[PDB]
Amino acid sequence: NSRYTHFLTQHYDAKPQGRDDRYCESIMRRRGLTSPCKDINTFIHGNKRSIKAICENKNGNPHRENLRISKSSFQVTTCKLHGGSPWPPCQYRATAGFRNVVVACENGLPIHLDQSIFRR
C-alpha cells in the first residue's frame, strides 16, 4: 500500500522537464524532501510498469541481502545537496544518468531505492 506510494513520491518522475540543477531544486521541493534537505535523492523516469517489473523475474535479479537489481536500464536523475546547511533553501547539483537500478520489493512492488549506487 503506502510504501509503494511513498516510493513513487520519492523516486519516480515520468516525464521530467530538463533535469538540470533547477529541475532538482524544484522537484525536491514539490515532493517534500527539503525539511531538512535530503543529502542525495534519485528519480527514475519512464513508465511505472518497467519499475514494478524489477520485482519479478521479468525485469530483475535477486541482489545482495534481499534487494533486487533491474535487467533493463533506466533514465535517472540524481539530486545531490551542496552548500553547508542542512536546512532550506536546499541547493542541488543534478546528475542525469542511464543504467539499471536497485530496489527492495514487497508484495510485488518497489518500496525502497538503494541510493548507494548513485553516489560519487
From Swiss-Prot:
The keyword Nucleus applies. Keywords: Amyotrophic lateral sclerosis, Angiogenesis, Cytoplasm, Developmental protein, Differentiation, Disease variant, Disulfide bond, DNA-binding, Endonuclease, Hydrolase, Neurodegeneration, Nuclease, Nucleus, Protein synthesis inhibitor, Pyrrolidone carboxylic acid, Secreted, Signal, Stress response. Changing residue 20 to V: Found in a patient with Parkinson disease; uncertain significance. The keyword Nuclease applies. Changing residue 15 to I: In ALS9; loss of angiogenic activity; reduced ribonucleolytic activity; retains nuclear translocation. Has weak tRNA ribonuclease activity by itself due to partial autoinhibition by its C-terminus (residues 140-147), which folds into a short alpha-helix that partially occludes the substrate-binding site. In absence of stress, the ribonuclease activity is inhibited by RNH1 in the cytoplasm. In response to stress, dissociates from RNH1 in the cytoplasm and associates with cytoplasmic ribosomes with vacant A-sites: ribosomes directly activate the tRNA ribonuclease activity of ANG by refolding the C-terminal alpha-helix. Changing residue 52 to E: In ALS9; decreased interaction with the ribosome and ability to repress translation. Expressed predominantly in the liver. Also detected in endothelial cells and spinal cord neurons. Changing residue 119 to H: In ALS9; uncertain significance. It is an enzyme of class 3 (hydrolase). TRNA binds at residues 19-20, 79, 101. Changing residue 11 to A: Abolished ribonuclease activity. does not affect binding to PLXNB2 receptor. Changing residue 64 to A: Abolished binding to PLXNB2 receptor. One of its GO terms (cellular component) is nucleolus. Its EC number is 3.1.27.-. GO terms for molecular function: actin binding; copper ion binding; DNA binding; endonuclease activity; heparin binding; peptide binding; protein homodimerization activity; receptor ligand activity. Changing residue 78 to S: In ALS9; uncertain significance. It is found in: Secreted; Nucleus; Nucleus, Nucleolus; Cytoplasm, Stress granule. One of its GO terms (biological process) is response to hypoxia. Changing residue 66 to A: Slightly decreases binding affinity for RNH1. It is linked to Amyotrophic lateral sclerosis 9: A neurodegenerative disorder affecting upper motor neurons in the brain and lower motor neurons in the brain stem and spinal cord, resulting in fatal paralysis. Sensory abnormalities are absent. The pathologic hallmarks of the disease include pallor of the corticospinal tract due to loss of motor neurons, presence of ubiquitin-positive inclusions within surviving motor neurons, and deposition of pathologic aggregates. The etiology of amyotrophic lateral sclerosis is likely to be multifactorial, involving both genetic and environmental factors. Belongs to the pancreatic ribonuclease family. Secreted ribonuclease that can either promote or restrict cell proliferation of target cells, depending on the context. Endocytosed in target cells via its receptor PLXNB2 and translocates to the cytoplasm or nucleus. Under stress conditions, localizes to the cytoplasm and promotes the assembly of stress granules (SGs): specifically cleaves a subset of tRNAs within anticodon loops to produce tRNA-derived stress-induced fragments (tiRNAs), resulting in translation repression and inhibition of cell proliferation. tiRNas also prevent formation of apoptosome, thereby promoting cell survival. Homodimer. Interacts with RNH1; inhibiting ANG ribonuclease activity. Interacts with PCNA. This is Angiogenin. It comes from Homo sapiens (Human). The lineage of its organism: Eukaryota, Metazoa, Chordata, Craniata, Vertebrata. The chain holds residues 27 to 146 of 147 of the full protein.
